[PDB]
Amino acid sequence: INTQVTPGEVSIQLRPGAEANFMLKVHPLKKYPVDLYYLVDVSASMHNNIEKLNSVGNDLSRKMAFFSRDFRLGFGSYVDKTVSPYISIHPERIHNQCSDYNLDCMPPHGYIHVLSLTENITEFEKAVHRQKISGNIDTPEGGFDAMLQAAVCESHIGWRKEAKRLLLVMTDQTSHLALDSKLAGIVVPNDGNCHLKNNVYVKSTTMEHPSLGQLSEKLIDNNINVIFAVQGKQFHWYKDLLPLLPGTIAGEIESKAANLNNLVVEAYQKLISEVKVQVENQVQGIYFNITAICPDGSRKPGMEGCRNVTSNDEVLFNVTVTMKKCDNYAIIKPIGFNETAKIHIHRNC
Amino acid sequence: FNLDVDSPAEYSGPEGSYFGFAVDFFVPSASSRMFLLVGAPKANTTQPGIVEGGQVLKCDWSSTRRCQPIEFDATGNRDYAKDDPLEFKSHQWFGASVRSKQDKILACAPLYHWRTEMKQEREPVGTCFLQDGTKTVEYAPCRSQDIDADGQGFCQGGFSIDFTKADRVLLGGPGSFYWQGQLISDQVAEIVSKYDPNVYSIKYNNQLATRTAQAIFDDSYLGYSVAVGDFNGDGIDDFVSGVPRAARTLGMVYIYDGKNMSSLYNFTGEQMAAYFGFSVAATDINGDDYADVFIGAPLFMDRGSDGKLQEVGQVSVSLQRASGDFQTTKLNGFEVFARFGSAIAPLGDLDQDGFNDIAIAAPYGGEDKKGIVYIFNGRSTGLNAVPSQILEGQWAARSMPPSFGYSMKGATDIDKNGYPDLIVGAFGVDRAILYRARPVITVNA
Amino acid sequence: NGFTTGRRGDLATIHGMNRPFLLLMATPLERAQ
Numbered sequence: 031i032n033t034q035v036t037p038g039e040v041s042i043q044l045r046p047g048a049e050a051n052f053m054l055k056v057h058p059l060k061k062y063p064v065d066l067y068y069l070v071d072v073s074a075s076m077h078n079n080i081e082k083l084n085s086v087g088n089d090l091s092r093k094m095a096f097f098s099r100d101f102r103l104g105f106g107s108y109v110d111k112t113v114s115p116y117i118s119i120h121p122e123r124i125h126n127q128c129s130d131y132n133l134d135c136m137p138p139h140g141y142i143h144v145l146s147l148t149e150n151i152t153e154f155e156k157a158v159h160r161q162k163i164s165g166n167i168d169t170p171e172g173g174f175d176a177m178l179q180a181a182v183c184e185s186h187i188g189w190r191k192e193a194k195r196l197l198l199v200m201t202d203q204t205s206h207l208a209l210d211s212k213l214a215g216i217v218v219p220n221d222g223n224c225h226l227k228n229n230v231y232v233k234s235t236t237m238e239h240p241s242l243g244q245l246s247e248k249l250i251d252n253n254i255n256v257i258f259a260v261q262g263k264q265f266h267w268y269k270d271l272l273p274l275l276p277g278t279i280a281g282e283i284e285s286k287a288a289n290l291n292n293l294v295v296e297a298y299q300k301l302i303s304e305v306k307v308q309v310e311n312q313v314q315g316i317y318f319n320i321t322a323i324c325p326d327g328s329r330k331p332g333m334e335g336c337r338n339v340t341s342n343d344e345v346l347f348n349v350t351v352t353m354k355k356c357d358n359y360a361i362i363k364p365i366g367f368n369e370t371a372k373i374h375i376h377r378n379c
Numbered sequence: 380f381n382l383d384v385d386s387p388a389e390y391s392g393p394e395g396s397y398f399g400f401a402v403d404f405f406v407p408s409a410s411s412r413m414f415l416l417v418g419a420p421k422a423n424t425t426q427p428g429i430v431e432g433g434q435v436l437k438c439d440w441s442s443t444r445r446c447q448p449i450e451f452d453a454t455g456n457r458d459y460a461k462d463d464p465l466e467f468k469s470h471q472w473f474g475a476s477v478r479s480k481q482d483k484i485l486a487c488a489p490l491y492h493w494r495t496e497m498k499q500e501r502e503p504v505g506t507c508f509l510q511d512g513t514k515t516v517e518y519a520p521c522r523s524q525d526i527d528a529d530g531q532g533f534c535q536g537g538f539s540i541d542f543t544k545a546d547r548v549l550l551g552g553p554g555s556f557y558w559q560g561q562l563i564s565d566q567v568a569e570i571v572s573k574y575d576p577n578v579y580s581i582k583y584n585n586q587l588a589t590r591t592a593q594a595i596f597d598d599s600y601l602g603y604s605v606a607v608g609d610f611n612g613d614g615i616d617d618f619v620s621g622v623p624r625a626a627r628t629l630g631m632v633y634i635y636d637g638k639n640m641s642s643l644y645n646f647t648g649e650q651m652a653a654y655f656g657f658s659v660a661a662t663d664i665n666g667d668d669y670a671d672v673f674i675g676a677p678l679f680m681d682r683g684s685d686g687k688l689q690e691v692g693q694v695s696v697s698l699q700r701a702s703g704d705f706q707t708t709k710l711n712g713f714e715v716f717a718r719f720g721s722a723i724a725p726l727g728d729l730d731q732d733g734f735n736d737i738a739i740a741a742p743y744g745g746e747d748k749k750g751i752v753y754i755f756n757g758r759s760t761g762l763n764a765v766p767s768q769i770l771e772g773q774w775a776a777r778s779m780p781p782s783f784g785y786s787m788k789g790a791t792d793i794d795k796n797g798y799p800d801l802i803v804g805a806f807g808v809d810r811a812i813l814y815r816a817r818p819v820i821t822v823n824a
Numbered sequence: 825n826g827f828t829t830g831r832r833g834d835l836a837t838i839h840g841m842n843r844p845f846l847l848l849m850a851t852p853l854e855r856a857q
């Protein structure tokens with residue numbers, strides 16, 4: 031049944047003090063239907079860059095006509111949590127933080143979903159063209175909470191299981207962390223469900239941000255391939271976090287922002303030219319050992335896997351299951367891929 | 380290992396009032412009786428026109444658990460002019476930080492917005508009420524003549540507080556100077572004697588504070604948590620504060636000289652976005668008469684065996700030496716997502732051996748994420764890195780997680796059995812719990 | 825506008841617009857005579 035990750039299932043029996051093995055082969059496919067989502071920061075700092083979203087409609091779809099069977103796009107915006115001291119609570123400023131500068135800024139909002147994924151590029155251009163900016167006070171902005179909400183809500187955004195889910199997060203500044211909410215009286219940890227009721231993030235103001243570990247777990251669970259597109263010096267901040275966030279890419283947007291379509295397409299090519307795996311083991315005493323066999327023969331430890339992969343090129347993962355102590359299964363999946371291998375490990379004591 | 384979990388003394392506040400957010404002991408030696416002190420930052424009050432002010436309920440231990448709120452303040456919002464309120468006490472989170480010397484109580488409100496004098500605004504400067512026996516005072520050094528987001532307008536003064544052993548109050552405002560942070564030290568012998576109930580910006584003669592820095596230090600959050608202890612041999616306690624977003628969210632911890640607020644030593648985290656400096660507690664854990672630093676990083680992500688990362692938390696132990704050096708050791712948590720290292724509190728000498736002890740909490744750990752507290756014992760070398768006792772919360776989550784272990788206190792014997800005790804606050808179910816340390820006998824077979 | 829206290833944080837960019845400016849009306853170089 032599985033086409034890209036073979037074998038898709040393995041039944042093995044082990045006895046304590048013994049070790050088994052098999053071969054797991056991952057063969058990337060030629061072309062991928064791509065679903066891209068623009069989780070765009072629309073804070074006051076990002077005002078000069080929203081207008082540069084009118085070019086990405088047709089140009090990118092032309093650039094990505096050979097790398098993908100079909101194409102989809104979507105939109106969505108975030109600024110921050112709408113409580114003090116992140117926003118002003120003055121009755122004049124609470125609904126337009128820019129009013130002291132005579133601007134038509136939109137009311138701040140934790141996260142609003144705008145356009146579900148559609149193959150109509152004219153719809154994407156129309157949705158982007160009518161979009162305004164908002165404002166707040168703090169230097170960082172609440173991007174990670176919006177990222178989690180966009181990753182988890184599936185039928186609202188409109189992700190495809192048959193696609194290559196990508197998520198572009200366009201910003202220019204560092205994001206808020208988990209425990210930064212304690213200044214605002216939010217001491218309730220994030221639960222990891224998603225709470226879009228009318229395409230507005232209702233619970234942005236009652237539970238705090240997600241941490242890096244929770245965000246990463248939710249991203250990899252839903253097969254989301256994140257592509258940060260940061261602009262200022264904070265590209266480096268978003269880059270040094272890549273080790274802590276598997277399967278994420280960071281590109282730099284120059285001042286002219288003419289390098290946006292290229293950023294997306296080169297990031298997609300680098301994304302498609304890599305394979306790596308992890309294991310979600312919840313069994314007691316069983317330790318997994320995986321060494322990757324690159325087409326150049328390298329004996330990489332597998333956790334970062336083999337890079338520079340293309341099609342016409344099959345990558346093989348050497349596994350070694352141990353049985354150390356007695357008292358389920360483990361699923362080993364290539365991060366970013368849509369298929370997983372279910373190692374239905376039997377254990378007998 | 381001697382704390383008694385068979386007979387914990389229970390306490391309870393109003394539902395949904397965050398009872399137990401901050402805990403402490405009250406021991407007025409003049410009255411020779413022992414009282415708890417619990418904050419309820421979401422409690423309703425008697426104040427007119429104020430909803431959800433905050434209460435500091437003084438609870439008794441001697442067989443009567445009656446919690447009588449301390450009347451730190453009874454009035455509503457003072458006014459600037461007709462229908463021009465000067466301050467906004469609603470939802471002020473009063474009592475989120477309770478500290479008690481032998482005969483003083485200092486409870487602070489960090490979310491106290493007010494209408495600045497120059498223009499109609501809402502600036503969360505924060506305020507504190509210092510009750511000294513009979514006299515009650517108000518302490519609010521972050522509402523001043525020069526305030527805005529630029530200045531200390533968003534100071535949130537009173538997010539963290541502590542008492543120096545020399546009658547000073549160390550106050551930490553995380554949000555001043557565009558969230559760079561600030562520490563302020565001032566003596567009680569002047570807080571009381573300088574309080575005009577009709578003056579807002581009061582100038583204190585002998586106050587020590589930290590000033591503005593370069594714009595690259597924004598969102599550092601200095602003063603997110605404070606502690607005291609002698610660290611350069613002068614004898615006067617020195618101000619230790621945690622700045623958990625410095626150096627590109629690595630986290631740092633500063634130590635300032637307690638005589639003139641001059642920087643002495645710095646620490647630095649090793650992982651980005653780990654919250655180094657979230658909790659700071661300076662005790663003497665190896666018994667060598669030199670105070671030792673403890674630092675919490677609840678969100679540290681630690682490599683697993685296979686290479687997968689786990690967010691388990693980490694506590695850094697740093698033993699002060701006689702030459703100005705620090706011998707540092709790490710200490711990792713036990714359950715993923717448990718936020719080990721959230722709260723650290725010295726216990727005194729929990730078993731009377733000669734080396735003070737310490738306890739570290741993992742509020743979201745344990746079975747069904749009720750909460751767990753770990754008990755550590757000192758040695759001649761330093762801390763003993765395996766916990767002797769595991770304290771677990773007994774309360775299920777009603778709406779939000781019980782958060783058993785968010786705040787805790789020790790080092791005072793309430794039974795007067797000779798050994799220090801411990802109170803813990805599981806504010807997610809509006810409870811506090813007291814634990815008693817049993818006497819220890821050495822059998823020599 | 826543009827002269828209130830130095831705004832840092834998220835408002836720093838926005839502070840600069842509506843700044844006092846000049847409005848120049850001159851003939852084009854290509855249509856002199």
Ligand SMILES: *[C@@H]1O[C@H](CO)[C@@H](O[C@@H]2O[C@H](CO)[C@@H](O[C@@H]3O[C@H](CO[C@H]4O[C@H](CO)[C@@H](O)[C@H](O)[C@@H]4O)[C@@H](O)[C@H](O[C@H]4O[C@H](CO)[C@@H](O)[C@H](O)[C@@H]4O[C@H]4O[C@H](CO)[C@@H](O)[C@H](O)[C@@H]4O)[C@@H]3O)[C@H](O)[C@H]2NC(C)=O)[C@H](O)[C@H]1NC(C)=O
Binds near residue numbers: 596645
């Ligand atoms: C523990 O860790 C903390 C934090 O990392 C650290 O505190 C930091 O200390 C440094 C040094 O004291 C602070 O940086 C600056 O230090 C200079 C000292 O001046 C002399 O040294 C510099 C070094 O190159 C020389 O260039 C200079 O000419 C002198 O010889 C201060 O002068 C700085 O003050 C500036 O800010 C003031 C307020 O804005 C201004 O009024 C003042 O004029 C200075 O302005 C300068 O910079 C401006 C930048 O825009 C510029 O516009 C001005 O024209 C001028 O050039 C400043 O103090 C740093 O701020 C501290 N950070 C924090 C958070 O406190 C501790 O030292 C460290 N301790 C230990 C023991 O490790």
Ligand SMILES: *[C@@H]1O[C@H](CO)[C@@H](O[C@@H]2O[C@H](CO)[C@@H](O)[C@H](O)[C@H]2NC(C)=O)[C@H](O)[C@H]1NC(C)=O
Binds near residue numbers: 150151152153
């Ligand atoms: C793709 O979306 C565009 C709008 O973004 C659609 O064009 C609209 O078509 C309706 C008729 O159904 C007209 O009344 C509108 O004036 C059109 N808008 C624009 C901007 O031209 C287009 O029909 C959509 N594609 C398909 C196949 O339906």
Ligand SMILES: *[C@@H]1O[C@H](CO)[C@@H](O[C@@H]2O[C@H](CO)[C@@H](O)[C@H](O)[C@H]2NC(C)=O)[C@H](O)[C@H]1NC(C)=O
Binds near residue numbers: 033059062063191369
């Ligand atoms: C993973 O992706 C592949 C291709 O992107 C999916 O394979 C397609 O499956 C649909 C039905 O599910 C078929 O109609 C197509 O013909 C298949 N295409 C190819 C190229 O094989 C596969 O189903 C996806 N797996 C999951 C679990 O969503």
Ligand SMILES: *[C@@H]1O[C@H](CO)[C@@H](O[C@@H]2O[C@H](CO)[C@@H](O)[C@H](O)[C@H]2NC(C)=O)[C@H](O)[C@H]1NC(C)=O
Binds near residue numbers: 349
């Ligand atoms: C894949 O891994 C297995 C181990 O699980 C390798 O099998 C070992 O091969 C070496 C080479 O001769 C033998 O000395 C060992 O006795 C074999 N078994 C074990 C348990 O080590 C196998 O060679 C690997 N294949 C590749 C292509 O790397």
Ligand SMILES: *[C@@H]1O[C@H](CO)[C@@H](O[C@@H]2O[C@H](CO)[C@@H](O)[C@H](O)[C@H]2NC(C)=O)[C@H](O)[C@H]1NC(C)=O
Binds near residue numbers: 396
């Ligand atoms: C303190 O009392 C006030 C009322 O005086 C309570 O306010 C309630 O707030 C909820 C949601 O904000 C409303 O649905 C209720 O209608 C309010 N009550 C009334 C009587 O109007 C507040 O919940 C109380 N605080 C606590 C901690 O119990």
Ligand SMILES: *[C@@H]1O[C@H](CO)[C@@H](O)[C@H](O)[C@H]1NC(C)=O
Binds near residue numbers: 321
């Ligand atoms: C995994 O295999 C490597 C060599 O293939 C070996 O050095 C290592 O000890 C093994 N680890 C486990 C847990 O089996």
Ligand SMILES: *[C@@H]1O[C@H](CO)[C@@H](O)[C@H](O)[C@H]1NC(C)=O
Binds near residue numbers: 338
């Ligand atoms: C990646 O693959 C291409 C094509 O096989 C090859 O030319 C290139 O040298 C490879 N990169 C590295 C670093 O070996």
Ligand SMILES: *[C@@H]1O[C@H](CO)[C@@H](O)[C@H](O)[C@H]1NC(C)=O
Binds near residue numbers: 636638639641
């Ligand atoms: C602060 O006091 C200590 C005590 O000796 C001294 O070493 C230091 O130089 C003083 N700092 C300032 C700025 O006066």
Ligand SMILES: [Ca+2]
Binds near residue numbers: 167168170172834
């Ligand atoms: Ca923000």
Ligand SMILES: [Ca+2]
Binds near residue numbers: 616637
């Ligand atoms: Ca000192």
Ligand SMILES: [Ca+2]
Binds near residue numbers: 664665667668669670
């Ligand atoms: Ca010591």
Ligand SMILES: [Ca+2]
Binds near residue numbers: 757
């Ligand atoms: Ca001891």
Ligand SMILES: [Ca+2]
Binds near residue numbers: 793799816
């Ligand atoms: Ca006792």
Ligand SMILES: [Mg+2]
Binds near residue numbers: 074169171203
């Ligand atoms: Mg911004």
